[PDB]
Scaffold this active site. Structure first.
Site, PDB file in Angstrom:
ATOM      1  CB  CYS A 170      19.275  25.060  37.823  1.00 15.14           C
ATOM      2  SG  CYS A 170      19.989  25.622  36.260  1.00 15.14           S
TER       3      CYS A 170
ATOM      4  NE  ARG B 137      16.740  23.491  34.666  1.00 17.21           N
ATOM      5  CZ  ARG B 137      15.975  24.525  35.004  1.00 17.21           C
ATOM      6  NH1 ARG B 137      16.482  25.751  35.025  1.00 17.21           N
ATOM      7  NH2 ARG B 137      14.702  24.333  35.322  1.00 17.21           N
TER       8      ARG B 137
ATOM      9  CG  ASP C 191      14.414  13.687  36.108  1.00 18.09           C
ATOM     10  OD1 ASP C 191      13.448  14.361  36.516  1.00 18.09           O
ATOM     11  OD2 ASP C 191      14.829  12.661  36.690  1.00 18.09           O
TER      12      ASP C 191
END
Length: 156
Positions: free
Chosen positions: A8, A14, A124
């Site tokens: 990530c 996440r 987001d």
């Protein structure tokens, strides 16, 4: 000895949320056979905090604010450990490709799984513009990912 390395970009959105989700469900058919999972960033510059408007808010609704605070940095030695590699990030894919050897063929993209998701790098509002976005993205991505990750291929 099955190891799944999740990558990530920020690893502060996440990565942490999904980290708890996967870790939870895996106990069913992974922790039993002694499976291992690790989430790290691209350059580990900061990837490890675990906090974002969209993800945190989403977790605040019912889940836990966070519980995966671990500064990680996906590298060559680390990748050599995990048997499977995943990006999910649109840009992290191309980068990780030329950033690593010809062993990047073990990397997977969410673009192949996600249908009408067409998401960018991590949900987001800071990346998309909505908090609930983390809900649709993470929930869907983690689900499908769990399917393939739960031995959905042929062994040898």
């Amino acid at each position: 000895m099955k190891k799944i390395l999740f990558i990530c970009l920020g690893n502060i959105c996440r990565s942490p949320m999904a980290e708890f989700i996967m870790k939870d469900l895996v106990k069913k058919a992974n922790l039993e056979k002694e499976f291992f999972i690790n989430s790290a960033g691209t350059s580990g510059e900061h990837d490890g905090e675990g906090m974002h408007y969209g993800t945190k808010n989403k977790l605040a609704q019912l889940n836990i604010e966070h519980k995966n605070f671990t500064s990680k940095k996906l590298t060559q030695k680390l990748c050599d450990e995990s048997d499977f590699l995943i990006t999910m990030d649109n840009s992290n894919f191309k980068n990780v490709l030329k950033n690593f050897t010809n062993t990047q063929n073990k990397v997977l993209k969410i673009t192949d799984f996600s249908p009408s998701l067409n998401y960018d790098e991590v949900p987001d509002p800071w990346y998309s513009g909505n908090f609930d976005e983390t809900y649709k993205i993470l929930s869907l991505a983690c689900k499908n990912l769990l399917v393939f990750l739960s031995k959905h291929h042929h062994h040898h």
